[PDB]
Design a protein around this motif. Sequence first.
Motif, PDB file in Angstrom:
ATOM      1  N   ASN A  44       0.857  -1.184   0.000  1.00 22.89           N
ATOM      2  CA  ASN A  44       0.000   0.000   0.000  1.00 22.89           C
ATOM      3  C   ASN A  44       0.895   1.236   0.000  1.00 22.89           C
ATOM      4  O   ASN A  44       1.062   1.926   1.006  1.00 22.89           O
ATOM      5  CB  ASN A  44      -0.956  -0.018   1.188  1.00 22.89           C
ATOM      6  CG  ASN A  44      -2.052  -1.051   1.038  1.00 22.89           C
ATOM      7  OD1 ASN A  44      -2.074  -2.061   1.739  1.00 22.89           O
ATOM      8  ND2 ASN A  44      -2.978  -0.797   0.120  1.00 22.89           N
ATOM      9  N   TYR A  45       1.480   1.507  -1.161  1.00 20.50           N
ATOM     10  CA  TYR A  45       2.297   2.692  -1.371  1.00 20.50           C
ATOM     11  C   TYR A  45       1.468   3.897  -1.784  1.00 20.50           C
ATOM     12  O   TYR A  45       2.029   4.972  -2.016  1.00 20.50           O
ATOM     13  CB  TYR A  45       3.363   2.413  -2.432  1.00 20.50           C
ATOM     14  CG  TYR A  45       3.973   1.033  -2.331  1.00 20.50           C
ATOM     15  CD1 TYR A  45       4.636   0.630  -1.181  1.00 20.50           C
ATOM     16  CD2 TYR A  45       3.878   0.134  -3.385  1.00 20.50           C
ATOM     17  CE1 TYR A  45       5.192  -0.632  -1.085  1.00 20.50           C
ATOM     18  CE2 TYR A  45       4.430  -1.128  -3.298  1.00 20.50           C
ATOM     19  CZ  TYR A  45       5.086  -1.506  -2.147  1.00 20.50           C
ATOM     20  OH  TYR A  45       5.637  -2.762  -2.056  1.00 20.50           O
ATOM     21  N   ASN A  46       0.147   3.733  -1.887  1.00 17.18           N
ATOM     22  CA  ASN A  46      -0.722   4.829  -2.294  1.00 17.18           C
ATOM     23  C   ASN A  46      -0.722   5.972  -1.285  1.00 17.18           C
ATOM     24  O   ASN A  46      -0.931   7.131  -1.666  1.00 17.18           O
ATOM     25  CB  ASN A  46      -2.136   4.297  -2.526  1.00 17.18           C
ATOM     26  CG  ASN A  46      -2.729   3.646  -1.289  1.00 17.18           C
ATOM     27  OD1 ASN A  46      -2.142   3.682  -0.208  1.00 17.18           O
ATOM     28  ND2 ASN A  46      -3.895   3.032  -1.449  1.00 17.18           N
ATOM     29  N   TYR A  47      -0.497   5.676  -0.006  1.00 19.01           N
ATOM     30  CA  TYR A  47      -0.398   6.730   0.995  1.00 19.01           C
ATOM     31  C   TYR A  47       0.836   7.586   0.741  1.00 19.01           C
ATOM     32  O   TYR A  47       1.939   7.066   0.548  1.00 19.01           O
ATOM     33  CB  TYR A  47      -0.347   6.133   2.398  1.00 19.01           C
ATOM     34  CG  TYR A  47      -1.667   5.592   2.885  1.00 19.01           C
ATOM     35  CD1 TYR A  47      -2.854   6.261   2.622  1.00 19.01           C
ATOM     36  CD2 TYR A  47      -1.726   4.418   3.622  1.00 19.01           C
ATOM     37  CE1 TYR A  47      -4.060   5.772   3.071  1.00 19.01           C
ATOM     38  CE2 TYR A  47      -2.927   3.921   4.073  1.00 19.01           C
ATOM     39  CZ  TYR A  47      -4.091   4.603   3.798  1.00 19.01           C
ATOM     40  OH  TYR A  47      -5.291   4.111   4.251  1.00 19.01           O
ATOM     41  N   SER A  67       5.935   8.585  -1.139  1.00 19.10           N
ATOM     42  CA  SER A  67       5.067   7.480  -0.775  1.00 19.10           C
ATOM     43  C   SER A  67       5.622   6.724   0.428  1.00 19.10           C
ATOM     44  O   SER A  67       6.803   6.826   0.773  1.00 19.10           O
ATOM     45  CB  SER A  67       4.892   6.519  -1.949  1.00 19.10           C
ATOM     46  OG  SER A  67       4.271   5.321  -1.525  1.00 19.10           O
TER      47      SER A  67
END
Lengths: 49, 49
Positions: B3-6, B49
């Motif tokens: 979850n690198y979207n943050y 990220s």
Amino acid sequence: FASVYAWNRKRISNCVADYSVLYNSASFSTFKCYGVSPTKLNDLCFTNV
Amino acid sequence: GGNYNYRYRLFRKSNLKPFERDISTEIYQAGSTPCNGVQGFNCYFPLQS
């Protein structure tokens, strides 16, 4: 000067060094340094240059 | 898969203030030269990220 294989090394310390003249001098074409900001060399104060 | 979207703001012009949301995204000036919206050298991405 000397050739690149025998490059000339000089020490600069315990002095007040003017870098603005080097930057504004039109004789020099390349002043190209990026880890050192070209404008505030006078601000950059170090030893054993 | 990760979850690198943050993403978090890493580079800002100055400090924020209490209760300020930051969503504006712009090329960040990492030196003494204009960026003009190009992320090459001395011009980085504000968020990471």
